[PDB]
Amino acid sequence: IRRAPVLGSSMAYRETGAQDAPVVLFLHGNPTSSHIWRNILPLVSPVAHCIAPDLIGFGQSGKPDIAYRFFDHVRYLDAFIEQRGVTSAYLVAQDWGTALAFHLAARRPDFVRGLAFMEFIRPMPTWQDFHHTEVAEEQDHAEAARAVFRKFRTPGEGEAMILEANAFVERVLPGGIVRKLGDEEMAPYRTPFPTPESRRPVLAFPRELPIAGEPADVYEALQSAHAALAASSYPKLLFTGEPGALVSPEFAERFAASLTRCALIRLGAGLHYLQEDHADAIGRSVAGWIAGIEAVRPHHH
Amino acid sequence: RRAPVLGSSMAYRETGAQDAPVVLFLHGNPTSSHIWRNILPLVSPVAHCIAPDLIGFGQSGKPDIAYRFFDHVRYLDAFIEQRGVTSAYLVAQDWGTALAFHLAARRPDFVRGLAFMEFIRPMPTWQDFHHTEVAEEQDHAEAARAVFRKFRTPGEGEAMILEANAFVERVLPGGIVRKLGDEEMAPYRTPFPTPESRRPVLAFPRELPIAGEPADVYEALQSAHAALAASSYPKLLFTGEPGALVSPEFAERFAASLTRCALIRLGAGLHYLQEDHADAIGRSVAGWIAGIEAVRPQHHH
Ligand SMILES: [Cl-]
Ligand SMILES: [Cl-]
């Protein structure tokens, strides 16, 4: 684990691959860290310089006294990119990582060599757009998801659940993984969050989710980023699980077909944290895709 | 499925959208489209996959022909014509690769890309069959040479391949690291119920281009290799440890010497890499096709 000084604090990151290969930036979301990519990085490192940062307040990153809003993560990630001297990269992202990737691509399209993504954030006009699905057998699950996230966004209740009980780490995370993680696999997800204070960024994130116009700044930024994504022509790779969570199989198919140059990769049984159930498949998919793109569109005295 | 071809028929497997790029999967000795069964569904989301059974193999017809390499060329060409395929990616192993190289040599605009593994090349000497510099491998290499010399000897090959069914019962499982379930192994046996039915299995090792003989095939495959060396379409070479016809060291050097040839190093594996690495191969190929397709070409007086 390496450490980059960023805005008076620091961001931890993992790095692998040759310095002269294309950069791939791996972006985690809530409540994870670069730890979620641990079994994916070794499969991509043969073809790319892989960099996987821990978002500020997550993993082994610093814990500065900020609110940890989406726009805070934006600023810290931009400072990290500059600190590392990265001038362009492929982006691989899940959860809030996708929002960061979409917003980066909206501001700096020339930066983006390609975007591989899954279980992404989009503006959600109604609560039925959170965990959207029309499949009858999924309706109870979708309602339960909506109910818990409504509670996370409720004053008092969110604090009790996420800060006191650590429910995002202890319940939501395993709840989005089909297999049961080994204890040694689970431990590094827990270690960043020993106290209610330390859990502040974890509570911040669901309160940033763009639902029914609020918070308006995130909602509008993600509308703008999704419009940019829709018009974009850079290579895109969307992964889909069955049933998934934020992205249903039906929606993934429709969303991918509606973009330009977006392939859809089918992972099979999966929920929100697809990396933990499909590390090998995701890693090999991304490595092949980069090899393909670079084939066609790429020391002496 | 089944296509009438040259007065006989060839069976084939097919999946994927009719308007997607075509991918042709080419098996060799003594297999069939069966060997691709766990790979096809992984590529189907990005491509129209077609996997034929070579004449005299799998569920294809069993005409009274010699089943020389040039016979297989003729029937594969006629299959491609009958299916109305005008260009394709190729995915190949064993004799499938020789067919692929020869196809690409004669029709340089047909091939969209070539993914290959455990391929056939002109072998100036017997030491180039199962070539390896690794000391721990010498005894295995010599044992492969010894048995293939016998297959190629008139009289001897007949007893081993036709009567004892050695290529199906021994060589095939001998090139797979894991042990196939009875249900996986059965479709490999069913094409070959009798000594007469095994004629094509005996013909193939007698076609191997070794020490300049048979010289007609040797010359065709030399020309195919020269065309491959100069080719500019994207390529993807898979290797196993230690492999059989392709050593890790040979593969790495060969891939670097070509134009646009990516290498993927799969891990423990012998000749029939598909059976030990189906998921890795399918995911890699699907991603690689998606990548190449993603970067295809997008005011006046
Ligand atoms: Cl969240
Ligand atoms: Cl053979």
Candidates B201, B263, B116, B294; CA nearest to A116 is B294
d(CA B113, nearest CA chain A) in Å: 10
Say which residues have a Cβ less than 8 Å from residue A203's Cβ, sequence separation at least 6: A152, A158, A159, A162, A163, A168
CA A50, B293, A15 angle in degrees (round to 5)? 0
Question: Residue A29 CA: which ligand is closest?
Answer: 1
Distance B174 CA to ligand 2 centre (A): 14
Nearest CB to B288 within list A261, A281, A288: A288
Q: In whole angstroms, give the CA distance from residue A257 to residue B17.
A: 13
**A67, two tokens:** 């609110």
Cβ partners under 8 Å of residue A126, min gap 6: A211, A212
B144: Cβ contacts below 8 Å, ≥ 6 apart: B129, B130, B244
| Technique used to solve these coordinates | X-ray
Query: In 3D, which of A267, A270, A262 has the Cα closest to residue A289?
Result: A262
> Cα–Cα distance between A64 and A42 in angstroms, integer?
31
Which residue, chain included where needed, has tokens 């196993």? B240
d(C-alpha A232, C-alpha B174), whole Å = 50
Q: Which of B70, B134, B59, B142 is nearest to B99 (CA)?
A: B70
CB-based contact A70:A104 (threshold 8 Å): no
Closest ligand to residue A32's CA: 1
CA distance A88 to A113: 7
Q: How far apart are CA A128 and CA A132, in angstroms?
A: 6
**Comparing C-alpha atoms, which of A157, A6, A161 is closest to residue A74?**
A6
The partner residue sitting opposite B286, judged by closest CB among A47, A285, A297, is A285
Q: What are A175's two structure tokens? A: 């709840």
Ligand at minimal distance from the CA of A207 is 1
Q: What homologous superfamily is domain A1-301 in, according to CATH? A: Alpha/Beta hydrolase fold, catalytic domain (3.40.50.1820)
Chain B residues with CB inside 8 Å of A237's CB? 287, 290
Q: What's the gap in Å between B59 CA and the centre of ligand 2?
A: 19
Domain boundaries, chain B: 1-301
Structure tokens given for B10: 């060839």
- Closest Cα of chain B to A276: distance in Å? 16
Cα(B255) to centroid of ligand 2, in Å? 23
Q: Give the integer Cα–Cα distance in Å for A167 and A178.
A: 18
From the CA of A30, how far away is ligand 1's center (Å)? Answer: 6
Angle between helices A216-231 and A96-107 (to 10 degrees): 70
* Cα-Cα end-to-end distance for chain B: 53
Q: Which letter does DSSP use for residue A214 in this model?
A: B
Task: Decide if A263 and B236 are in contact by the 8 Å CB cutoff.
Answer: no
Cα separations (Å) of B281 from A196, A231, B216?
45, 32, 33
- Return the beta strands (E) in chain B as ranges: 2-5, 8-15, 22-26, 48-52, 88-94, 111-119, 235-242, 261-269
Catalytic residue list of A: 95, 119, 272
Q: Do the strands A2-6 and A9-16 form a parallel or antiparallel pair, or are they unpaired?
A: antiparallel
Q: Which residues of A touch B286 (CB under 8 A)?
A: 265, 285, 288
At what resolution in Å was this solved? 1.8
Under a CB-based contact definition with an 8 Å cutoff, are residues A236 and A262 in contact? yes
Bridge partners (DSSP) of residue A238 are A117, A264
Catalytic residue at B271? Answer: yes
Residue in A47, A281, A289 nearest the CB of B290:
A289
Quote the tokens at residue A17: 């691959």
CA distance B276 to B56: 25
Ligand 2 midpoint to CA B44 (Å)? 29
Q: Nearest C-alpha of chain B: how many angstroms from A252?
A: 12
- Tokens 């069939």 correspond to B32
A interface mutation test: which of B236, B284, B289 has the most A CBs within 10 A? B284
Q: Which chain B residue's Cα is nearest to A286?
A: B287
Residue A180 main-chain phi, psi, to 5 deg:
-100, 120
